[PDB]
XYZ file of N, CA, C and O in Angstrom:
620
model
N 116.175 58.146 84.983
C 117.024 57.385 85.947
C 116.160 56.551 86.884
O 115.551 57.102 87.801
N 116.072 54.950 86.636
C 114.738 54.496 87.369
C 115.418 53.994 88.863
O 114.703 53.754 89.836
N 117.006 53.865 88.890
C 117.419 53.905 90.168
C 117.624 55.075 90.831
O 118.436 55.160 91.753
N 116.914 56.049 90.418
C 116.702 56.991 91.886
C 116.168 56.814 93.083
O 116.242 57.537 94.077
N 115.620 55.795 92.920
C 114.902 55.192 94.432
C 115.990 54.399 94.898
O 115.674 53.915 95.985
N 117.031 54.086 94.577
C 117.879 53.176 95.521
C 118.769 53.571 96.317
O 119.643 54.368 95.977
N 118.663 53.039 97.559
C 119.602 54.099 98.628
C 120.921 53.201 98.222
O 121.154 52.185 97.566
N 121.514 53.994 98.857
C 123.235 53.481 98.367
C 123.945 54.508 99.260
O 124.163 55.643 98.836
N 124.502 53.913 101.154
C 125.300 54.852 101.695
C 126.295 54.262 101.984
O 126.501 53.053 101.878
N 127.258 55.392 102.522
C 128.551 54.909 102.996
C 129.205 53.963 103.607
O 130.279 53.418 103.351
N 127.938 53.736 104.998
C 128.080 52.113 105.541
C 127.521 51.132 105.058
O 127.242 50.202 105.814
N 127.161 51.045 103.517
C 126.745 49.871 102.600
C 127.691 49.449 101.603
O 127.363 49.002 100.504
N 128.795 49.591 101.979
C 130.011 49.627 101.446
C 131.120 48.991 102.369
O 131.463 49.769 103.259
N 131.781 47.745 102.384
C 132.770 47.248 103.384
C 133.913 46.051 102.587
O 133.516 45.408 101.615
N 134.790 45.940 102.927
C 135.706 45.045 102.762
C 135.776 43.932 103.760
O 136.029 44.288 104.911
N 135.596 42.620 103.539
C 135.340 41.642 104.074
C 136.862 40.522 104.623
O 137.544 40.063 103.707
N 137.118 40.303 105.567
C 138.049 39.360 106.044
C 138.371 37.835 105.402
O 137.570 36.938 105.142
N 139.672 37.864 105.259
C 139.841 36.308 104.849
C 139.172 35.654 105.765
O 138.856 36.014 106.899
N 138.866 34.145 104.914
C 138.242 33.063 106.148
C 136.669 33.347 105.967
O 136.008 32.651 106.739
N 135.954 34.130 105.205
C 134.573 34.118 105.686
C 133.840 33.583 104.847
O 134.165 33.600 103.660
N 132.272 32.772 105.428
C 131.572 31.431 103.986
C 131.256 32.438 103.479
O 131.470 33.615 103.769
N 130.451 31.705 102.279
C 128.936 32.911 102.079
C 127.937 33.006 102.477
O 127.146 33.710 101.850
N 127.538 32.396 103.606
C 126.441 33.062 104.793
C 127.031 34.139 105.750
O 126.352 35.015 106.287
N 128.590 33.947 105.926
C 129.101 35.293 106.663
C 128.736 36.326 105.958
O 127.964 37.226 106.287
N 129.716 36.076 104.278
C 129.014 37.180 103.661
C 127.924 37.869 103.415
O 128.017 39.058 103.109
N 126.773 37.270 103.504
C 125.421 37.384 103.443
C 125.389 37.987 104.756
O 125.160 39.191 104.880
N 125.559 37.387 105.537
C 124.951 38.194 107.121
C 125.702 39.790 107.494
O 125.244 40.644 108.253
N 126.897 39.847 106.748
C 127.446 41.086 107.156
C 127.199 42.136 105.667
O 127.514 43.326 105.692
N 126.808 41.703 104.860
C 126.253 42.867 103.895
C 124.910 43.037 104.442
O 124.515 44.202 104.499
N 124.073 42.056 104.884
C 122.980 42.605 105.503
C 122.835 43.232 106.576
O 122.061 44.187 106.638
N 123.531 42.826 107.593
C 123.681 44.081 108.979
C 123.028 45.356 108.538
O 121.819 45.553 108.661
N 123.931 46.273 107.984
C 123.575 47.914 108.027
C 122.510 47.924 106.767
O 122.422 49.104 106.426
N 121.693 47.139 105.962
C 120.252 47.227 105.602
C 118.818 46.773 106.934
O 117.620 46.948 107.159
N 119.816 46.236 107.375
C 118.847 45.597 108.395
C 118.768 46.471 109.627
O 117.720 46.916 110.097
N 119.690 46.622 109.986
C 119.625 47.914 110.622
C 118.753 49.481 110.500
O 118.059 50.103 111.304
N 119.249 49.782 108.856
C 118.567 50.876 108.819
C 117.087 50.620 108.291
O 116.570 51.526 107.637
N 116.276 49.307 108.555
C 115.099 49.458 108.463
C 114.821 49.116 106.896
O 113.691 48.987 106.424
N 115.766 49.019 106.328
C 115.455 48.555 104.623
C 115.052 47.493 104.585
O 114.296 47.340 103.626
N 115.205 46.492 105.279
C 114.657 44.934 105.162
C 114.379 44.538 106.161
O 114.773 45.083 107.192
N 113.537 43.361 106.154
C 113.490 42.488 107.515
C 114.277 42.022 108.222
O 115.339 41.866 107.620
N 114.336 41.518 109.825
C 114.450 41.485 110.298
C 116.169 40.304 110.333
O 117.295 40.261 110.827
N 115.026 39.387 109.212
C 115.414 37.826 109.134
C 115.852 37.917 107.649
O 115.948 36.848 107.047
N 116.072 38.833 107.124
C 116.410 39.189 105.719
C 117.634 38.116 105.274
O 117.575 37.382 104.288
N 118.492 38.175 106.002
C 119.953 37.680 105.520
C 119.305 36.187 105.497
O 119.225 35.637 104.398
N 118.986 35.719 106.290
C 118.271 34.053 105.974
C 117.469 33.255 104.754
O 117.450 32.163 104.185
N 116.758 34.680 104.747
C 116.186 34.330 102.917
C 117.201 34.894 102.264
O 117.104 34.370 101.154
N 117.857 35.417 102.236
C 118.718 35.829 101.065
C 119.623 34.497 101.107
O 120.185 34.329 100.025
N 119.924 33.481 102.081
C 121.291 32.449 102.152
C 120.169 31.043 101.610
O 120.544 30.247 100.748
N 119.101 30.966 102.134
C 118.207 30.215 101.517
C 118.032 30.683 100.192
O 118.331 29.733 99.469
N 117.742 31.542 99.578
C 117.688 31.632 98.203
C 118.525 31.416 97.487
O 118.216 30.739 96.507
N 119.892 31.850 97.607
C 121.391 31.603 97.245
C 121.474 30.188 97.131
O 122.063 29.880 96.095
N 121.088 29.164 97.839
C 121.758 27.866 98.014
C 120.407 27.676 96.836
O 120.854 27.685 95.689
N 119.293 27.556 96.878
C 118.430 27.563 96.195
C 118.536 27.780 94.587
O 118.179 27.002 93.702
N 119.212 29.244 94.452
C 118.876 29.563 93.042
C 120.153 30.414 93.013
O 120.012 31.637 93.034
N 121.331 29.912 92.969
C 122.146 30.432 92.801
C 122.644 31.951 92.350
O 121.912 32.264 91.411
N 123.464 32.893 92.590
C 123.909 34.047 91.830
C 125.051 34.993 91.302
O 125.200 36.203 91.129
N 126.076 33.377 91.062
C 127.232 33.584 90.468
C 127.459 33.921 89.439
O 127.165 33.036 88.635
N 128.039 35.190 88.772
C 128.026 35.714 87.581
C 130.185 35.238 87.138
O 131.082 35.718 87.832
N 130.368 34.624 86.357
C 131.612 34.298 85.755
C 132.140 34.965 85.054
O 132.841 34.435 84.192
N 132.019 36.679 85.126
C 132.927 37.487 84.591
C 133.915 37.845 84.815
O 134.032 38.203 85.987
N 135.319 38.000 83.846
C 136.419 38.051 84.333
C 136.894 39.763 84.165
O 136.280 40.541 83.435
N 137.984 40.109 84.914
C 138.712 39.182 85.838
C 138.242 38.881 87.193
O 138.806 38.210 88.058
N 137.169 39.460 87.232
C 136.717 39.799 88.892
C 135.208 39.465 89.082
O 134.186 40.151 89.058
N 135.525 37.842 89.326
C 134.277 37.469 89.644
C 133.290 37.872 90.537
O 133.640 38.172 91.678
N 131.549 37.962 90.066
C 130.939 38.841 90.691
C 129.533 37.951 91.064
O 129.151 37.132 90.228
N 128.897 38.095 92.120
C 127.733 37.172 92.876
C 126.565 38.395 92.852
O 126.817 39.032 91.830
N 125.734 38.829 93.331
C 124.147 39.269 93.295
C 123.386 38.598 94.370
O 122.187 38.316 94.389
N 124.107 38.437 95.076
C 122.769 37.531 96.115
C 121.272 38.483 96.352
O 121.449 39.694 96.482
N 119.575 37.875 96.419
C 118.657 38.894 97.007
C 117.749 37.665 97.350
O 118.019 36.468 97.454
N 116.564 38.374 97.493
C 115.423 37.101 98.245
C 114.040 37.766 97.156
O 113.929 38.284 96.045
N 113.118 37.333 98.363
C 111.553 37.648 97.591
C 111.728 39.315 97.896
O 112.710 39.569 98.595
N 110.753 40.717 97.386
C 110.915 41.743 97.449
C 109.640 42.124 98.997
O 109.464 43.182 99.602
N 109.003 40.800 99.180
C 108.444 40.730 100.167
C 108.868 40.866 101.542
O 108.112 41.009 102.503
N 110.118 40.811 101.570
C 111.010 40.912 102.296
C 111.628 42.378 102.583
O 112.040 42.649 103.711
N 111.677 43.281 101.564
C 112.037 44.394 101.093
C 110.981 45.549 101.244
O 109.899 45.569 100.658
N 111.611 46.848 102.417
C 110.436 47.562 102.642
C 111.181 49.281 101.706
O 110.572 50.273 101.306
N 112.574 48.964 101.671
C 113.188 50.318 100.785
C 113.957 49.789 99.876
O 114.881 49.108 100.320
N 113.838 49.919 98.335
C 115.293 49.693 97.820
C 116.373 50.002 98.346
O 116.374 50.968 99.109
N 117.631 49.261 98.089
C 118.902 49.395 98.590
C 120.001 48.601 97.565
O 119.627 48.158 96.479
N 121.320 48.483 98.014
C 122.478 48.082 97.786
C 123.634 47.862 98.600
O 123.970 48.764 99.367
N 124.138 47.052 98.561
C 125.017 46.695 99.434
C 126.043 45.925 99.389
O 126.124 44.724 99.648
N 127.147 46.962 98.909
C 128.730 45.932 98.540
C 129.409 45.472 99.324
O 129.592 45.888 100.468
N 129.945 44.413 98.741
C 131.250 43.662 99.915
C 132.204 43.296 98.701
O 131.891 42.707 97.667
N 133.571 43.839 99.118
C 134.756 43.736 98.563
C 135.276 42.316 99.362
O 135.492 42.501 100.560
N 135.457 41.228 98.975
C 136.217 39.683 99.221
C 137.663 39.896 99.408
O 138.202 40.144 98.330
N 138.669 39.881 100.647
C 139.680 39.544 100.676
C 140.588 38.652 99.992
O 141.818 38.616 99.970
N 139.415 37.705 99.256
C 139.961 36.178 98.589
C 138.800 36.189 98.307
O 137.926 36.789 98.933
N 138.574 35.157 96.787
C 138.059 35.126 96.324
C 137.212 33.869 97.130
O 137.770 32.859 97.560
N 135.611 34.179 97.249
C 134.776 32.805 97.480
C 133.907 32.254 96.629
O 132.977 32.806 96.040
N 134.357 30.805 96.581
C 132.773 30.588 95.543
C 131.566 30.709 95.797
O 131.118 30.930 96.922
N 130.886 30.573 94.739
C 129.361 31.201 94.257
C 129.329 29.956 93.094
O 130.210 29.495 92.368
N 127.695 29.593 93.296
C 127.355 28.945 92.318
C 127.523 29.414 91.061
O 128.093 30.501 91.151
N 127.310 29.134 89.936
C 127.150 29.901 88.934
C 125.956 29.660 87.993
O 125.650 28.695 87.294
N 125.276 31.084 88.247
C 123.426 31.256 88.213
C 123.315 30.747 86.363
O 122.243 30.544 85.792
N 124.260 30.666 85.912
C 123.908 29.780 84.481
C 123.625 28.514 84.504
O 122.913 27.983 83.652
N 124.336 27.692 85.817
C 124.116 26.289 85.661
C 125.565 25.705 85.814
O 126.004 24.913 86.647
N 126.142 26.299 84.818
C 127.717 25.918 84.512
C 128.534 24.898 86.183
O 128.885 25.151 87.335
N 128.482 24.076 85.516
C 129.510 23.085 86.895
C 130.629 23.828 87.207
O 130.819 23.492 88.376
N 131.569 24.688 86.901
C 132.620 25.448 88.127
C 131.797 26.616 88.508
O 131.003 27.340 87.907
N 132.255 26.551 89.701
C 131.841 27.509 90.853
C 132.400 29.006 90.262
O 133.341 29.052 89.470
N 131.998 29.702 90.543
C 132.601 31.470 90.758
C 133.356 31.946 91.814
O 133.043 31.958 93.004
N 134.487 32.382 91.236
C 135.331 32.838 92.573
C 135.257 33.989 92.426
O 135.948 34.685 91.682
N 134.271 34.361 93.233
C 133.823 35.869 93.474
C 134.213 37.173 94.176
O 133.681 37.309 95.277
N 134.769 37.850 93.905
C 135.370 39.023 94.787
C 134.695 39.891 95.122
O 134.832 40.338 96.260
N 133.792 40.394 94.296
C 132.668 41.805 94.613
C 131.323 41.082 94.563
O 130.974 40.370 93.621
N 130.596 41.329 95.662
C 129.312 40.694 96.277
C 128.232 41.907 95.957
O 128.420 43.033 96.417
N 127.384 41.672 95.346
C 126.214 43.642 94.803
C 125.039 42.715 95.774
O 124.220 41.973 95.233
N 125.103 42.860 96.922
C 123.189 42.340 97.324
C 122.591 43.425 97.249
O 122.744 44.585 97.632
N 121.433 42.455 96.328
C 119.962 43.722 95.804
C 118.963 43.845 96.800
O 118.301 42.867 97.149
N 118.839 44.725 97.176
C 117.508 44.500 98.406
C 116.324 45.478 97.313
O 116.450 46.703 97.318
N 115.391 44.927 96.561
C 114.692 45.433 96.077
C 112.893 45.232 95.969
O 112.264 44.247 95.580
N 112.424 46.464 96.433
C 110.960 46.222 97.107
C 109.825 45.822 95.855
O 108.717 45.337 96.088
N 110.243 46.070 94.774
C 109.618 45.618 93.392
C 110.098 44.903 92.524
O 111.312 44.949 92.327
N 109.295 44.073 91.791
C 109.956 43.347 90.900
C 109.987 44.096 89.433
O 110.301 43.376 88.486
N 109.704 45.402 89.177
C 109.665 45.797 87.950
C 110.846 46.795 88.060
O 111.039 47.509 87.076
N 111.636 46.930 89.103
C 112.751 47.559 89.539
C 114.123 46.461 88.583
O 115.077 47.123 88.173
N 114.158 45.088 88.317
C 114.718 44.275 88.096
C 115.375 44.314 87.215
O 116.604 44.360 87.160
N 114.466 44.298 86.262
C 115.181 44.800 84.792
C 116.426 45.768 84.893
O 117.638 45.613 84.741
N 115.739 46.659 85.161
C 116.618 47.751 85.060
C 117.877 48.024 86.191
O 118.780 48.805 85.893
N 117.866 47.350 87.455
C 119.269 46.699 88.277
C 119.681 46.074 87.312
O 120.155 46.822 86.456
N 119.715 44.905 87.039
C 120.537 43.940 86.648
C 120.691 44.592 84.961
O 121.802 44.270 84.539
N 120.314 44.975 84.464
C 120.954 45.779 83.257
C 122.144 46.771 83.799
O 122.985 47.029 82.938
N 122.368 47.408 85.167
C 122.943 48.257 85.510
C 124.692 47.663 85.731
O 125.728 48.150 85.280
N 124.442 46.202 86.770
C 124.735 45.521 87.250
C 126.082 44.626 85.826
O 127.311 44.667 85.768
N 125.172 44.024 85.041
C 125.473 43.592 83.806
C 126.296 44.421 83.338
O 127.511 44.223 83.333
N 125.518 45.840 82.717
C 126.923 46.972 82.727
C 128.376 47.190 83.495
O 129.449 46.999 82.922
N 128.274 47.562 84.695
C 129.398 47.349 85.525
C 130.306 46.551 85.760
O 131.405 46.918 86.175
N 129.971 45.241 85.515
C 130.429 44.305 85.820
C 131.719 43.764 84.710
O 132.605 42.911 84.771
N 131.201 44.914 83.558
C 131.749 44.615 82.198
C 132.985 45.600 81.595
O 133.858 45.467 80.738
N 132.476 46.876 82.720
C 133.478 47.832 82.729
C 135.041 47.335 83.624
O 135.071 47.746 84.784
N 135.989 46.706 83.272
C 137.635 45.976 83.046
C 137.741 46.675 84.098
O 137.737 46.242 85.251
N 137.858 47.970 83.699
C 138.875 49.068 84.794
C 138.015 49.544 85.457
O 138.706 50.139 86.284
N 136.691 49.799 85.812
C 135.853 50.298 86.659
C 135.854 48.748 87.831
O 135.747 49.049 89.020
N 135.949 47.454 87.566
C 135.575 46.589 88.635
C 137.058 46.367 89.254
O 137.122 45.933 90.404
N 138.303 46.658 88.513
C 139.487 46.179 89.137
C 139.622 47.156 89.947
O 139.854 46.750 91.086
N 139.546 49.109 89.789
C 139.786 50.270 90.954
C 138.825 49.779 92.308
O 138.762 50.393 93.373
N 138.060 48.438 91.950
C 136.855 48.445 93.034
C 137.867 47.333 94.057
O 137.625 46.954 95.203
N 138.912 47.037 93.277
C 139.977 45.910 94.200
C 141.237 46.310 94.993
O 142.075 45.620 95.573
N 141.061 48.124 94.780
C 142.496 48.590 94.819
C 142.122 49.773 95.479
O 143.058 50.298 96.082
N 140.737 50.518 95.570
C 140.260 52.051 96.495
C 139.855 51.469 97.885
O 139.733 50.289 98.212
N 139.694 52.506 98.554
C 139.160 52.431 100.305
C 137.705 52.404 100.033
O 137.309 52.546 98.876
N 137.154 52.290 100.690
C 135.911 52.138 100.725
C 135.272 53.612 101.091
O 134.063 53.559 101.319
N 135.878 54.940 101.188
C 135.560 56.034 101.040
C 134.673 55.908 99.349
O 133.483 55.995 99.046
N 136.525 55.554 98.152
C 136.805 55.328 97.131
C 135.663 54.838 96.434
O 134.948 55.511 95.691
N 135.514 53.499 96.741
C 134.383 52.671 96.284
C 133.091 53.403 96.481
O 132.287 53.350 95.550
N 132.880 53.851 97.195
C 131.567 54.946 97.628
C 131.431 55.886 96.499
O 130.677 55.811 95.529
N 132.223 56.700 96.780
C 132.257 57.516 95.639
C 131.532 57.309 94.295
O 130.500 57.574 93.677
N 132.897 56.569 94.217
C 132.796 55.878 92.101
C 131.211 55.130 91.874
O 130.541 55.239 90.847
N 130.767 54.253 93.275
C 129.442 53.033 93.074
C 128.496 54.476 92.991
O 127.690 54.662 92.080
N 128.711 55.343 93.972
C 127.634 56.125 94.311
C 127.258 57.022 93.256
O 126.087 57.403 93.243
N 128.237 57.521 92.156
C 128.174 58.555 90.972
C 127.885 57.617 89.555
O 127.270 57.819 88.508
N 128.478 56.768 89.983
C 127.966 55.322 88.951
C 126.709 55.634 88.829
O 126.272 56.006 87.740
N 125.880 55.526 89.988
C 124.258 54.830 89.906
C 123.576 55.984 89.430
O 122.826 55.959 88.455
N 123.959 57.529 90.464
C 123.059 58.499 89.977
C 123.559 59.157 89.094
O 122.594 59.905 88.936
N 124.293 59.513 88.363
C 125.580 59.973 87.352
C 124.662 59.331 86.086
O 125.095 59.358 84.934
């Protein structure tokens, strides 16, 4: 299990308000990493600079899904950090593809290695693919979502 190093807690888990860009989003999934010392300071800034940069819209249906992260230089603990979208916001889409992603579930990677990568985004890729595992992620509390993300990863 090579994500045993990734923290994944209860307040890394939130449902997000209509009305917000994706630098809101970005700044409020980063709060409680930034807080608990997992990243820098200024973390959410490279992560919104990188985003506009190098996009990380994934176009899977039904429930479009984004990945925003930065350099791992930035990154002093692995982590994770979901945001459930009230409404869907766009996201570039990290293929290139000219329509945007209307994204509902936001996964920011805060990850201190790059050989950690592979094996997120294989995880990520998985999940994303599981129908009925990403739609209960549109319809549980965020107790809920805890749970299921949290037994997901180490499970």
């Amino acid at each position: 299990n090579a994500m045993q190093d990734i923290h994944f807690r209860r307040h890394y888990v939130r449902h997000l308000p209509k009305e917000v860009s994706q630098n809101d989003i970005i700044k409020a999934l980063a709060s409680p990493l930034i807080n608990d010392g997992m990243v820098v300071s200024d973390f959410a800034d490279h992560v919104i600079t990188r985003e506009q940069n190098f996009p990380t819209g994934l176009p899977v249906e039904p429930v479009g899904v984004a990945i925003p992260h930065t350099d791992h230089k930035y990154v002093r603990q692995n982590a994770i950090s979901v945001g459930i979208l009230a409404e869907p916001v766009n996201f570039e889409d990290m293929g290139g593809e000219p329509d945007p992603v209307p994204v509902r579930v936001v996964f920011m990677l805060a990850l201190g290695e790059s050989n950690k990568q592979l094996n997120v985004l294989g995880w990520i890729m998985d999940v994303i693919q599981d129908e009925d595992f990403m739609q209960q992620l549109l319809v549980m509390n965020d107790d809920e979502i805890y749970q299921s993300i949290y037994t997901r990863i180490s499970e």
